[PDB]
Design a protein around this ligand. Sequence first.
Ligand SMILES: CC(C)n1cnc2c(NCc3nc4cc(Cl)c(Cl)cc4[nH]3)nc(N3CCOCC3)nc21
Lengths: 248, 327, 826
Amino acid sequence: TKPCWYWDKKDLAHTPSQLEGLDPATEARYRREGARFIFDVGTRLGLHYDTLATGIIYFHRFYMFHSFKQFPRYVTGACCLFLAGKVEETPKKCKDIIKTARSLLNDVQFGQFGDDPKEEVMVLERILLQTIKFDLQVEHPYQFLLKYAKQLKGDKNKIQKLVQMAWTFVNDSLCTTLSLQWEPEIIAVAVMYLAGRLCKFEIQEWTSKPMYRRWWEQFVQDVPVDVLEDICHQILDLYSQGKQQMPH
Amino acid sequence: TESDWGKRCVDKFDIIGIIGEGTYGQVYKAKDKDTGELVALKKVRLDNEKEGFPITAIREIKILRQLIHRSVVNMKEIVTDKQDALDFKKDKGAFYLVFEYMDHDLMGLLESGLVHFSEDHIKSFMKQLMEGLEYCHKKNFLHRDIKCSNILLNNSGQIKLADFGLARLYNSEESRPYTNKVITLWYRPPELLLGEERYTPAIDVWSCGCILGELFTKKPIFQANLELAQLELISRLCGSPCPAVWPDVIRLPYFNTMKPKKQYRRRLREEFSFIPSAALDLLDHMLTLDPSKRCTAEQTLQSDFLKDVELSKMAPPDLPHWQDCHE
Amino acid sequence: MSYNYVVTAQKPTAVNGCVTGHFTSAEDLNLLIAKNTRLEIYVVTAEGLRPVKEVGMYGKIAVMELFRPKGESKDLLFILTAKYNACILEYKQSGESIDIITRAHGNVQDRIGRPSETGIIGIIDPECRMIGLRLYDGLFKVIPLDRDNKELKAFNIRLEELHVIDVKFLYGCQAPTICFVYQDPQGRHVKTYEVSLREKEFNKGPWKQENVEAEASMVIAVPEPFGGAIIIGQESITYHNGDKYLAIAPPIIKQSTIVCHNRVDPNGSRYLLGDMEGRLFMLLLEKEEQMDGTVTLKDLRVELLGETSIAECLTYLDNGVVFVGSRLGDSQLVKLNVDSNEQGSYVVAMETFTNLGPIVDMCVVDLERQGQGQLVTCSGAFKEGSLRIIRNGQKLHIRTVPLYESPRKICYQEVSQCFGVLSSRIEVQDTSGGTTALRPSASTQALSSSVSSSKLFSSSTAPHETSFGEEVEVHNLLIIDQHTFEVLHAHQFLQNEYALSLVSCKLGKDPNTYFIVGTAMVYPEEAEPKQGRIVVFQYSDGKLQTVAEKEVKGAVYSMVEFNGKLLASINSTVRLYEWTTEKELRTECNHYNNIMALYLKTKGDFILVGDLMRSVLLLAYKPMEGNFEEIARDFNPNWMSAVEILDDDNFLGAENAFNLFVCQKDSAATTDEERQHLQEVGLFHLGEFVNVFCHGSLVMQNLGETSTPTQGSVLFGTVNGMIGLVTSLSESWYNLLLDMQNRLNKVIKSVGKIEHSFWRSFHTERKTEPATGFIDGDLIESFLDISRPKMQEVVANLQYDDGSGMKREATADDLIKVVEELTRIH
Ligand SMILES: CC(C)n1cnc2c(NCc3nc4cc(Cl)c(Cl)cc4[nH]3)nc(N3CCOCC3)nc21
């Protein structure tokens, strides 16, 4: 019926890119750069946040089936965004994506697009579609962050701070392979959980079951803390590696 | 696995012939070589590559892999032409969207004059159509192109809704700017003839009410060539749009522009007095001018006409295939 | 675009209706006969009929009635066309000048309504206060006959009884009253209502409802001496007057369905009834008088008079003379005698009026070898079935070859100097367990005979039960000599086997010329036949021999010879069979993308397929590959009655709606999608139902005449007897004849003031389109009949094009030359 789009962390040691000689650090760097390229390009074009995320998910899934050494990442990114726009009904003309990609990429980087940027991108759509197995509908942590936050009742301002901080963690998680490891529902809970610790908030008190200390279980069944804490560790590693710090 | 679409080749189907001109390609009848099942193949041509894979086809893939209903057409797989070996840039081969083959389409059966519907045949039809539309509406999808030609019917009496090339998600909380001209003029609701642009799922209800009327006469109800003439015909039957019956008609772009000849009174019950009472009430409620007063799909399924219709007793319409040769 | 011309070679001959009255003068007795689109007016004499006038109307005549409103000296005529065009007409004569006046007219079509199963019904009040129309289920339309209603404006009264069988205005009522039989789930019923013009609604009618026979078919308004209604059924005749019920159920009428009635005595004492086996009855109303001074109906009696043609309409004229209007056989004048003849009959035929009947099939062959064509048709049904041989010589010469059974298909075999004809005759289940024919006929009066002994379906194991009195069709192949038209042989097909298709040809390397028949095993239980045969026969030395049989899984609706191979359509499949050196059929290729492959035509390696509902498809044999390929399909849905290939690019089709069209290859070869699309470039409403297209002409070719503007010749036969002809034009000749039509339509006065452009519009219940690509040759040929002032008024400011001179003015005599050449194509 429908494909499985989730892998184990251990399995990322055997992506095609790795087995062609790329090191773990480099592939993740390429993944961050490609995702952020998609994010920046689409943001300049005024694209909805779902459209950016869908392209990023297409991108991350793509490179579980292909090597970065054979598919230049910014071309792939541009193609994913191009298709994402059609899928999510926020369409853009390919020429306009190229124009924006040229604005944001230096001369070396834009070299990936070759002599005819639009063609390199349009040609890839065929491979993109076969690779994503025509499973075009994608759900993202955002909708669950809001669906679950609507069921919290209490201090309007403490909850809005929780949501905004968690939303930033969702945006930051798009640079990682978490999209490939956990369902979006789990990602939304994990980011709520992280913001709670960072905001020193006890979310159970906002739930309909205030003496249920594992507050998320009434949103996402069968999720151990093991998972939510692995996800938090991966999100905060992003901040520690960089110069950036937690939003608070 | 069954889920790895886009790889299997169209070699796996014996093409029987062309059954229609589509929007994004030609549509073919074919037989599966392995199972013997008859399929319908919708061809997607990306060779034009003006904007790549057509969005119309993307809508149908995105939506029809989510929707599971006995009255919603089923996409089985997507297959491809023989791909060029080790040369993906040259590869211009097409994709084919695989559907079940349905014996007929409602237009062809009605245009050829080869169908007759009893009240009980119309009950079986409308219960399926509305149940299918309700499934879609509960999932927040608008069909936006409900015409007789997009209702497929196979000889067992089963109805299936078909072309989702204009289907988009509807958000009640967030009003979204949509395309002004979506439904074929004959089945277009009055709200869109005035250019709503933010329409409700009630647009689909109007079309089906138009079909409900057509099944009782075998002739479409509102046949016009131009948007103004259409509003006139609807007005002659349903009454002219005016704040008395549609308080928000004054907010619509073309309300002052597209006035009908008169401020007509509603005669729907008079001109359809030959229709059974239970059905006439459904038509009157489905062909309500104000989309916020026009009944929902669910409300039709909880009507005297369709509520107690049983799907086990499908009563296939009277499609005669003998004595047609010699009268 | 495509340009074509359509002319009538023989006008419709089947009688659609007949009325009597005082239409031409308050003094004369008139007989008005309605043929499709044609009205014939006669005056009744003591020897027969004197013709006085014939007019055409731009419409099929659906209702025809005479009435005389207070203040008129003579009867007026009401006509309603099948496109809902209504009018009131008057005859006016000024010495030698006869014309028809349009007194009132209008179109009564409703925007919303369901066409009724029993068709349009039109009746008029005995006081001529109003016209009643039953056009749609659940509605009764009233045109009040006031002096001012020159536009025939009308209103609808809601009718609760949705399924009405028949209705009449009753005699002897205080208010206008209708008596109608209707059907609901509880059976059939007779009910009465009063019609109030003041209130524009129904009020309760004079008398109570009664339950009537399940197959109650006709309502007779019995006149004033006994006022009431007579309800005719399959088994019984019942009289109702309010408190009166009388029912006679004589066993003689159960045998055949009664279909027409007419009043003999204006007092209602005697009525005529006719049935589908030609029997003519007298329905006699026995009166008892009461000293109250009042007359009552005592009893009903039915007496058999004799035989007529299977008649659609009957009308008694005067003395003993009756006009028999038939749609399935020749019409007649017959005299009813008081004394029976020695055979027991009171009916003796006077005159016989030719009716080409339903033309089920036809072919063009040159029997006389005079370089001119003869048309041999399959005409008529049942006992009126016949072959008709039509030749040109100024009138058409028609020979009738009675067959006394139904002819289905005909094909000519020169090698054998004879025709092959498929026929079917009606036998009835009899007490022996077998069946018995009602009359001897062609298949039983053959010189030599044979019966199929095939064992193909012999295994059967399918149970089919028989009840005494049920009908069956028995199908035969008739071998008929081309000079004598003697039935030389008759081959009877299997029980329940229908013969559907017939060809005469040679196959492969086989020098023998065969008759080949395609059949279908027809069982009442089946929605669509699932068994069939292709049989190869050889007619040799007065005996038909069975050469080979090929079993198929369906009905062989159509066959055609294809370059030494047999092209057959079996249900949805189109197949090409090869003829082996072992004299057996062997399949080469199949094409399956059809709904029902009803009709096949070929040209070269190209095949035109007529589908039940998917219009026409163009196939091609690809010999390099040994398979079929699809060239183009008409994606507009239409119900085909017959098809024909005009040339390599243009294709002709006929609709069940009485409409014609022409499809052409798009010939814009940029995209494959364009090439696979057949564009309907010609649309035309003929008004006739075309069963058969056939290439050929009856015209002579001595070369005295010149190359006419027209090229090609397709003859077509119809259900009403019309023979028409389709031919092509150059762009230049079309534009001239088209521009001339628009000029003629402004000049020529139409009966009922019906717009010509409307009449020839493509019309289905769901669509209406203006005609295109077709010149109404019958309009063009009427230029030669209009007065000189009108002729010059037509040619004013008329310019030719694409000629020797690019712009040339026309004079009246210039057009007379063109039109007169165009009259020579038939
Ligand atoms: C692709 C999906 C939606 N699908 C699945 N079964 C069908 C389907 N079947 C009805 C049908 N059987 C035909 C056979 C012949 Cl020979 C001909 Cl000529 C026409 C025909 N139609 N039709 C259509 N549409 C018919 C109207 O034009 C567009 C396609 N779609 C379908």
